[PDB]
From a paper:
Afterwards, the choline kinase LicA phosphorylates choline in the cytoplasm to form phosphocholine, which is further activated into CDP-choline by the phosphocholine cytidylyl transferase LicC. Therefore, the choline kinase LicA is crucial due to its role in initiating phosphorylcholine metabolism pathway. Here we determined the crystal structures of apo-form LicA at 1.94 Å (apo-LicA) and two complex forms with choline (LicA-choline) and AMP/MES (LicA-AMP-MES) at 2.01 Å and 1.45 Å, respectively. The structure of LicA adopts a protein kinase-like fold which comprises of an N-terminal domain (residues 1–92) and a C-terminal domain (residues 93–283).
Each asymmetric unit contains two molecules of LicA. The interface between the two molecules is about 650 Å2, which is not large enough to maintain a stable dimer. In fact, LicA exists as a monomer in solution, which was confirmed by gel-filtration chromatography. The overall structures of two molecules are very similar with a root-mean-square deviation (RMSD) of 0.4 Å over 280 Cα atoms, thus we took molecule A for further structural analyses. Three structures presented the snapshots of the conformational change in the active site upon substrate binding and products release. In the apo-form state, the enzyme adopts an open conformation (1), with the P-loop protruding outwards from a wider active-site pocket. Despite no metal observed in the three structures, we propose that the activity of LicA is dependent on Mg2+, as deprivation of metal ions using ethylenediaminetetraacetic acid (EDTA) drastically diminished its activity by 6 fold.
Residue numbers in the entry:
A (entry chain A): -1 to 13, 18 to 283
B (entry chain B): -1 to 13, 19 to 283
The structure:
């Protein structure tokens, strides 16, 4: 297999490869390389995700955040090749929408650490600008019902956020539960910092809550772990960022599906939840 | 009788049909009906010194004037234990029901005071305020299981410190009846006797608690109030509700030691702190 061979030549500089396995997620460009000694996570990136992710920026941000010890080790990051190679924590457990709700005392400290880090990431996340970005990148008509009316309801939140005050801190930006992994010592790592950018920390909170479908009670309990003098909490900003997230990810989905991918109902389901969020708000 | 006769011989230097005794959390307030104007006559003395620094109150009245939130004060005579205010004729005094229709008016008033940047005389340190009442109370505190409840309340000091405590000009006493609607349409916020430096969440907690806001009403009000300059912490609000019920329950014990009778006000406020501690 040619893909199998390419991986062997990309990682031999770090060494007896016994196995290469295709990994899921939301990018088919992920592989697991098993060696005699160690196991490696091999990530590819080429054409589609450029125009989305600045890889030079990502490389800087990886180097930047290393001392926080939140992410796993990165061995290789070569933009030329389009190759990323990370440490694979063997016998580590990936969190999901159920198990994440048992880990508040570990997740809250992780989020406090990044949000209060004073780290200056390359990249600013300006959600309305991001919406404009995806709109520009999408070639066909956006397939979602009532889009022009929804878009304009969403854009009315910009003034609201401005009135509420927008903070600018280092954020992960993509707190799906599978981005948390627990090692045997019970240490939680937060991985996959590809979208990471300066933003309001309430974005990260909204993402955590939304991706795992936190109940109102679970949100309040999590906020009691998280809220502090250095980490203030705005419930309204969270509600607004949930809508912006559903909007942005639904558009991301349309773009990705034009670039080859198929995510079933993922896009429409997120879009419709944005519409519901707008009606409740 | 003699009450009418002190009032005339005090408010005379401002110019008298009748005089009426007003209800509430005091029996020392009087309505003086005058030919041209209506007056609120407020008496204080020994029963409220050691609680209210009347010199600081007078300074604070002066400092807060440019906000234009309170009614006109004509006379503030400390030496004589007498305060005289404008009374707003044909005003609507808000209550726990009507206050909930006035969010678009109340929220900017609270924003105006909280962002005033004014340095009032008086710091409101709630745990120090609890220690103060305990010292002032001469008989035992009658509230059941007080030691254990007080220990629980004092555990909130560290939590508040972890959350961060802000220090701003606050009204400190947001009973609905302190909001007055003029027939002209404007709202007045009156009775600034307790006003001092505190976290603005104390004021929000007082507003919510004194008028028994529902969760939804609180949420709606917060949407009017929350801004970059006036951030909101729900947890801090829940904590200040407990501290308020505790402090006012103790204030009640102190006042009743002077012979005043608030019925079940004190114990009900105490139990609401107890119940707040259990829910928290």
């Amino acid at each position: 297999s040619h893909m199998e061979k390419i991986i062997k030549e990309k990682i031999s500089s770090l060494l007896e490869v016994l196995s290469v396995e295709q990994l899921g997620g939301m990018t088919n460009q992920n592989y697991l390389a098993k060696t005699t000694n160690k196991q490696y996570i091999v990530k590819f990136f080429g054409k589609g995700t450029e125009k989305l992710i600045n890889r030079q920026d990502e490389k800087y941000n990886l180097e930047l955040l290393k001392d926080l010890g939140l992410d796993v080790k990165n061995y290789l990051f070569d933009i030329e090749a389009g190759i990323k190679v990370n440490e694979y924590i063997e016998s580590a457990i990936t969190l999901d929408s159920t198990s994440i709700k048992t880990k508040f005392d570990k997740i809250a400290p992780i989020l406090q650490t990044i949000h209060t880090s004073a780290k200056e990431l390359r990249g600013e996340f300006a959600p309305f600008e991001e919406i404009k970005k995806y709109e520009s990148l999408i070639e066909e008509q956006i397939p979602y019902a009532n889009y022009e009316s929804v878009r304009n309801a969403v854009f009315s939140l910009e003034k609201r956020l401005a009135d509420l005050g927008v903070d600018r801190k280092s954020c992960h930006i993509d707190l799906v539960p599978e981005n948390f992994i627990e090692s045997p010592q019970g240490r939680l790592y937060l991985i996959d910092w590809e979208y990471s950018s300066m933003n309001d920390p309430m974005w990260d909170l909204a993402a955590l809550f939304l991706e795992s479908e936190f109940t109102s009670q679970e949100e309040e309990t999590f906020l009691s772990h998280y809220e502090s003098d250095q980490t203030p909490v705005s419930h309204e900003k969270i509600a607004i960022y949930k809508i912006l997230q559903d909007t942005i990810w639904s558009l991301w989905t349309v773009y990705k599906e034009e670039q080859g991918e198929d995510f079933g109902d993922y896009g429409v389901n997120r879009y419709q939840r944005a519409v519901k969020g707008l009606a409740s708000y």
